């Protein structure tokens, strides 16, 4: 449930707000019951011709003034206590939530993603804040007033309520089928559209290939296709809902028809009084269209429940391994033993691949063992599974031979300390930085163990020696200063087991020896299993190890390994956009807006029309000198019918036409944004802000909010304005006195709403600041989770958050108070205005100035009119929402990328010469521009050769290709394509002429046959020519078994095909494009050696004639590869 987070006084805030909202609502119907006392008595005065006239009139006045004070107190106790309970619930939601996220496992952390987390937290919450803030208040008031029409009709005159009641159920059916068909459609619409979304997700999911083969366009059309079906049923549901509302109003009007004629009979029976009836009309009118004019508030609550859903999914959760409980044993006497056990473990993200498949190790307390070999063999997969980040799927790890699952982890991850693989820092001082060892470290406890890594010169050197700031990832340091604070930092825990893992690799070997030997003699009783760098600093371990593919069979001491011929004898050898640009994105479809607005003025001004209906009704009702009822009022029952059918047509029109305007804009802009994105350079997506999920939300939610402005603004604001204005006209017309005075409220409500909107936007601003501060904290852990668990210092982060979060808390307090104040002002002055002008108009009559019935028309025009400002400024928050979203997608539009993918001018080389040449090409990636890529590169291939490459693990071994396909402009050097340099190229041709094997080439939300066919757009390459290239890839002889030949929709990133198959295809994805320059980076990885060669085999008598660069770090087909380049920090060797 939403409210499930509420203390007692929370609930007292609520219930007092809700009963006072009931009284807020019951205000104006009872104002009409006294309308009726007044109408009866004073129409009998007017028609009959009462010198108490002024007396009685001011009496009724002070009655309405009493109700003025009544609605005042009601309004602001409503808003005060509603927003206050909302805010206290908000902060409690946030505390227990953020608690839960720090509590939910790392697994769950690699199934969701960070910016998606933080964005969920912030916007989810703020959504819930306005959801349950005060909207619920307006809604309970607005249903109160319509529901008070019920009893008021019955108590005042029990005649016409009979008939109108007796019509109510059939309207029950009207709105029944309303919700039935709206729900049916929109559910089918989402259940479909979510596919149009997932195809965007999977296409933007590997922008690499989607650019690496120009195949932008096939995917733009895939989008527009699923968007086609959804947009189709768009206008359909628009119809159904507007059909429904038109039915609703047809039936209200013909119901008033029955009522008016039936009760005409009654009043002409000289029975009861014009008061009872004419009220039972009026008191049953306001309530009804009001509770009608309630769509946005139930919109709000809908959004809010949808929000709170997944948040409570997060909160109520619980893992099998917990971070906040004494869930088991927690012993004192421990010798730092640790022994793996038949570990068969795999990720909860990349589940299918298993990394450790049975490892029978042995470590004792005090004795250190060395962890070395080749990369990927299991070092990090060894370190993570010890502090039980990822619950071993089938493996187990035990200290002293018992269940570490029963070792209370708040004790486990606090007794052992693994100085991180890559030293991560925080936006702290060096003091607090190390303090994250435990937290209570006196200055000496700091300095003494600080010096144990020589951190005393560059720390005692700075102005504010220690108290100067370690920056962003240590941005006020680098490796020569950073990796020192770490290896002594978590030391201050005095770990019962320290563990080293490539943790001293970024300085001079002096500091390395300091941290190594100062932690060689410091581990007198604690072991330290070492993943090291050098082949003599691996040896400071009583036993050395060998990492072999999930089986521990070879390991031991110095004289225990080198003589064994395993690995150890092998090893040593927001520029704001305008009102106009938003309003101009929808320019083609003007007539839909002209239609929407004309029908809007009709729908709106139709109410003071009802003032005139009922006003000339009063007079005709008065005398009855003839058989008036069935002779005239039959006509009026008709007019009600005519306005009923006119309302059906005008409603259905304005609603439907804005529905179709909404569809129009959404399809258009979704498509344009998707295209724009897929065009841009590669250097946009290789970032951390502009990710995949960030982008999917950007697209969907941003087009949605671009419509939310106009596609619902004109209609609602327009009902309101032409309504106020139609009453305005009427009032000015009859007696030009009462408008002005009853418009003496326009300055109060005007400047009040204005100061409230300005100081409420100011609230939004101070809030963005305060939660932006708070979210700095948030994001810190939310990103660095790998460490904030391992230091077991997440709970202080909890508390530091909470104290910051107090920020938008007191903000909310100010917000509740200023908002309550303003809207109390508004309501109370509306009522006070009725009373005062009412009064003055009494004596106006006692001139004769206005025929009474005219005053009642005037007052009644007003009392109808203003009932349209209920949420007239409630759709303002969504407008600034849209305006922001607009400036965002416009940053996404006009950005003229450096290297355009649609090269219009330049050279479109109609022939290919495979001569690429490098000479001293230097390059650095954009993300974190400290470290470089190359130390000057110079290489080249001729036609048909094989420039093979082999080296260590990840030393500039990816960036080979990405400089040739013109992703990036390599900083300073020579890169060209056969004399005519690349910068002359038409990258379209160039990109469609090369060939790449992706590092992990995905498949799409597509069949078997287009995936391959993808490789050549600008022309549909035919069905057959695949089977050759699919047999030349030795992948068609497999399609033998697949159920459909070529209609397998291999689900989101290859669901029905394994990776090896999703690699065994990779080659076929281009071959028909005729890639004359093969750039194979990790050509064949996931196959079997008999067929794994057919990647190259099937090519052996065909790779020739067309140049290439083949890079697959193996032995059987590099030893027959021509040219070699050794990767030594980015050179050619």
């Amino acid at each position, epitope marked *: 449930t939403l409210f499930r987070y509420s203390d007692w006084q929370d609930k007292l805030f609520m219930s007092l707000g809700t009963i006072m909202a009931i009284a807020h609502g019951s205000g104006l119907p009872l104002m009409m019951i006294v309308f009726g006392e007044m109408t009866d008595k004073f129409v009998d005065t007017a028609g009959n011709f009462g010198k108490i006239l002024e007396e009685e009139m001011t009496r009724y006045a002070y009655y309405y003034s009493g109700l003025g004070a009544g609605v005042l107190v009601a309004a602001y106790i409503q808003v005060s206590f509603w927003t206050l309970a909302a805010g206290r619930q908000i902060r409690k939601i946030r505390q227990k939530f953020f608690h839960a996220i720090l509590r939910q496992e790392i697994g769950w952390f690699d199934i969701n993603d960070t910016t998606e987390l933080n964005t969920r937290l912030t916007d989810d919450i703020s959504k819930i804040s306005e959801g349950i803030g005060d909207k619920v208040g307006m809604f309970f008031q607005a249903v109160a007033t319509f529901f008070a029409g019920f009893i008021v009709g019955f108590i005042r005159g029990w005649k016409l309520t009979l008939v109108i009641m007796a019509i109510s159920p059939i309207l029950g059916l009207s709105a029944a089928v309303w919700a039935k068909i709206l729900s049916a459609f929109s559910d089918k619409e989402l259940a479909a559209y979510a596919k149009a979304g997932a195809v965007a997700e999977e296409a933007l999911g590997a922008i690499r290939t989607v650019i690496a083969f120009g195949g932008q366009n096939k995917e733009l059309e895939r989008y527009q296709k699923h968007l086609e079906n959804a947009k189709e049923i768009g206008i359909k549901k628009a119809i159904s809902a507007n059909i429904s509302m038109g039915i609703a109003f047809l039936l209200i009007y013909a119901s008033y028809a029955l009522a008016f004629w039936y009760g005409s009979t009654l009043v002409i029976s000289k029975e009861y009084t014009i008061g009872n009836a004419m009220t039972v009309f009026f008191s049953i009118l306001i309530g009804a269209f009001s509770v009608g004019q309630a769509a946005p508030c139930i919109d709000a609550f809908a959004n809010a429940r949808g929000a709170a859903y997944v948040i409570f999914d997060i909160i109520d959760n619980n893992p099998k391994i917990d971070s906040f409980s004494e869930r088991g044993h927690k012993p004192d006497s421990i010798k730092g033993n640790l022994e793996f056990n038949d570990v068969h473990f795999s990720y909860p993200s990349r589940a299918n691949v298993k990394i450790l498949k049975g490892l029978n190790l042995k470590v004792q307390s005090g004795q250190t063992v060395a962890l070395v070999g080749s990369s990927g063999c299991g070092k990090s997969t060894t370190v993570q599974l010890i502090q039980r980040l990822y619950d071993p799927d089938e493996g187990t790890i035990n200290i002293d031979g018992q269940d570490i699952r029963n070792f209370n982890v708040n004790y486990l991850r606090e*007794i052992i300390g693994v100085v991180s693989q890559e030293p991560v820092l925080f936006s702290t001082t060096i003091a607090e930085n190390i303090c994250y060892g435990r*937290g209570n470290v*006196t*200055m000496d406890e700091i300095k003494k163990a600080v010096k144990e890594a020589n951190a005393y010169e560059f720390i005692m050197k700075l102005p504010q020696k220690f108290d100067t700031l370690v920056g962003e990832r240590g941005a006020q340091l680098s490796g020569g200063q950073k990796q020192r604070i770490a290896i002594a930092r978590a030391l201050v825990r005095n770990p019962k087991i320290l563990l080293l893992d490539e943790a001293t690799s970024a300085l001079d070997t002096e500091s390395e020896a300091e941290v190594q030997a100062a932690l060689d003699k410091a581990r007198e009783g604690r072991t330290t299993i070492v993943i090291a760098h050098r082949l003599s600093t691996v040896r400071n371990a009583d036993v050395i190890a060998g990492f072999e593919d999930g089986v521990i069979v070879e390991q031991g001491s110095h004289s225990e390994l080198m003589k064994k011929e395993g690995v150890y004898f092998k090893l040593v050898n927001v520029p704001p956009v305008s009102f106009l640009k938003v309003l101009k994105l929808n320019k083609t479809e003007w007539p839909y807006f002209v239609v929407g607005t004309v029908c809007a003025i009709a729908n709106g001004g139709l109410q003071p029309a009802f003032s005139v209906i009922f006003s000339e009704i009063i007079a005709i009702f008065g005398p009855g000198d003839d058989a008036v009822k069935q002779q005239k009022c039959n006509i009026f029952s008709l007019i009600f019918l005519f306005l009923g059918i006119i309302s059906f047509f005008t409603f259905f029109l304005q609603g439907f036409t804005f529905g179709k305007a909404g569809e129009i804009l959404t399809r258009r802009l979704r498509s344009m944004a998707f295209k724009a994105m897929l065009r841009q350079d590669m250097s946009w997506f290789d970032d951390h802000k502009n990710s995949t999920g960030a982008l999917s939300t950007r697209l969907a939610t941003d087009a949605a909010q671009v419509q939310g402005a106009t596609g619902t603004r004109l209609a609602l604001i327009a009902q309101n304005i032409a309504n106020l204005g139609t009453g305005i006209i009427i009032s000015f017309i009859y007696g030009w006195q009462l408008t002005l005075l009853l418009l003496a409220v326009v300055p109060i409500i005007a400047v009040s709403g204005i100061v409230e909107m300005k100081l409420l936007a100011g609230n939004a601003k101070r809030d963005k600041k305060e939660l932006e501060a708070a979210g700095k904290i948030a994001t810190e852990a939310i990103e660095n989770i790998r460490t904030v668990v391992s230091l077991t210092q997440e709970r202080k982060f909890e*508390s530091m958050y909470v104290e910051k979060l107090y920020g938008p808390y007191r903000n909310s307090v100010q917000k509740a108070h200023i908002y309550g104040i303003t809207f109390s002002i508004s309501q109370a002055f509306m009522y006070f205005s009725y009373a005062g002008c009412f009064r003055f108009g009494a004596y106006l009559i006692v001139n004769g100035h206005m025929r009474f019935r005219d005053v009642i028309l005037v007052f009644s025009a007003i009392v109808f009119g203003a009932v349209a400002l209920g949420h007239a400024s409630s759709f303002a928050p969504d407008y600034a929402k849209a305006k922001l979203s607009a400036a965002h997608l416009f940053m996404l539009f006009e950005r003229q990328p450096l290297i355009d993918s649609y090269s219009e001018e330049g050279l479109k080389p109609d022939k290919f010469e495979g001569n690429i040449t490098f000479n001293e090409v230097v390059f650095n990636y954009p993300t974190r521009a400290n470290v470089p890529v190359l130390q000057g590169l110079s290489l080249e291939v001729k036609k048909g050769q094989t420039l093979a490459l082999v080296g260590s693990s990840g030393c500039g071994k990816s960036t080979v290709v990405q400089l040739l396909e013109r992703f990036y402009d390599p900083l300073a050097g020579t890169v060209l394509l056969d004399g005519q340099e690349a910068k002359k190229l038409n990258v379209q041709w160039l990109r469609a002429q090369l060939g790449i094997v992706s590092q992990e080439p995905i498949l799409f939300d597509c069949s078997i046959a287009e995936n391959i066919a993808y490789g050549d757009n600008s022309r549909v390459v035919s069905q057959d020519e695949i089977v050759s290239a699919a047999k030349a890839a030795n992948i068609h002889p497999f399609i033998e078994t697949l159920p459909h030949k070529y209609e397998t929709r291999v689900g989101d990133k290859g669901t029905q095909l394994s990776g090896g198959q999703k690699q065994r295809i990779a080659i076929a994805r281009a071959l028909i494009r005729q890639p004359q320059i093969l750039l194979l980076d990790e050509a064949t990885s996931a196959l079997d050696t008999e067929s794994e060669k057919v990647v190259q085999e099937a090519l052996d008598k065909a790779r020739e004639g067309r140049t290439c660069i083949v890079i697959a770090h193996r032995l059987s087909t590099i030893q027959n590869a021509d040219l070699i380049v050794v990767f030594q920090n980015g050179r050619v060797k």
Partner: antibody
Framework: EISEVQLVESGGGLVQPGGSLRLSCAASGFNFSSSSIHWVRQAPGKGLEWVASISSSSGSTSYADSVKGRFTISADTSKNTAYLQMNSLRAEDTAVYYC????????????????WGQGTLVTVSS | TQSPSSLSASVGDRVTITCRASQSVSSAVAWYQQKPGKAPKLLIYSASSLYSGVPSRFSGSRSGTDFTLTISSLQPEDFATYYCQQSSSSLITFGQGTKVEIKR
């Protein structure tokens, strides 16, 4: 408090067997969630003697057996002060009252008495 | 509570002030060198560790039910009262300690 002791004075005075006090040990240099404030009794001519234990993290409450029942410790993480109300004043309740500190986010300590304040000497007389 | 191993004699002994456990708990006692008229100061925790501000003369460990503080080499620099505080229960008992000095 991480470089000093900031448990500051609160509630110093004299008591008669018809008196009482709302004694306090206003912690500082940290915030209550980081600790579990403790008091003890320094009875003259004997060792130290514990009275109670509150931890505003969980709101726990463990009293001694003599001052049991008639007392209360009520800390407020908002205002950062522990609050032991000595009511029902008989004679031997007089002493100097070392009000202490603790780290609760380092379970290895296993001695919630890491810091110590001087103590508000409470004196019954005649 | 502990048994008073209050030693104050001529120079040259390894006084290991012993502390018996009032009951059977998990091994947690904290020791102090209180000066009668002063406020206690932490020396060791966990009955085995070493807090800050301490010179490397104070030390302790467990021996079953035996919580010890080891101070050797009777000097002209040994005078205080000591204190045990038992732990590992919702309530805590104590030890009264000893009283060391120099014996000419």
């Amino acid at each position: 408090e991480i470089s000093e002791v900031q448990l500051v004075e609160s509630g110093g005075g004299l008591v008669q067997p018809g008196g009482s006090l709302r004694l306090s040990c206003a912690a500082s240099g940290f915030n209550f969630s980081s600790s579990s404030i403790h008091w003890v009794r320094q009875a003259p001519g004997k060792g130290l003697e514990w009275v109670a234990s509150i931890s505003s993290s969980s709101g726990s409450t463990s009293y001694a057996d003599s001052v049991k029942g008639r007392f209360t410790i009520s800390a407020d993480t908002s205002k950062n002060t522990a609050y032991l109300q000595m009511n029902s004043l008989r004679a031997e309740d007089t002493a100097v009252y070392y009000c202490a500190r603790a780290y609760i986010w380092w379970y290895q300590m296993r001695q919630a008495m890491d810091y110590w304040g001087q103590g508000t000497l409470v004196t019954v007389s005649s | 509570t502990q048994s008073p191993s209050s030693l104050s004699a001529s120079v040259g002994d390894r006084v290991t002030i012993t502390c018996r456990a009032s009951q059977s708990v998990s091994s947690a006692v904290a020791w102090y060198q209180q000066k009668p008229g002063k406020a206690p100061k932490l020396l060791i925790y966990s009955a085995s560790s070493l807090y800050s501000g301490v010179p490397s003369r104070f030390s302790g460990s467990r021996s079953g039910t035996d919580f010890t503080l080891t101070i050797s080499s009777l000097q002209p620099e040994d005078f205080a009262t000591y204190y045990c505080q038992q732990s590992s229960s919702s309530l805590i008992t104590f030890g009264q300690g000893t009283k060391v000095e120099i014996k000419r």
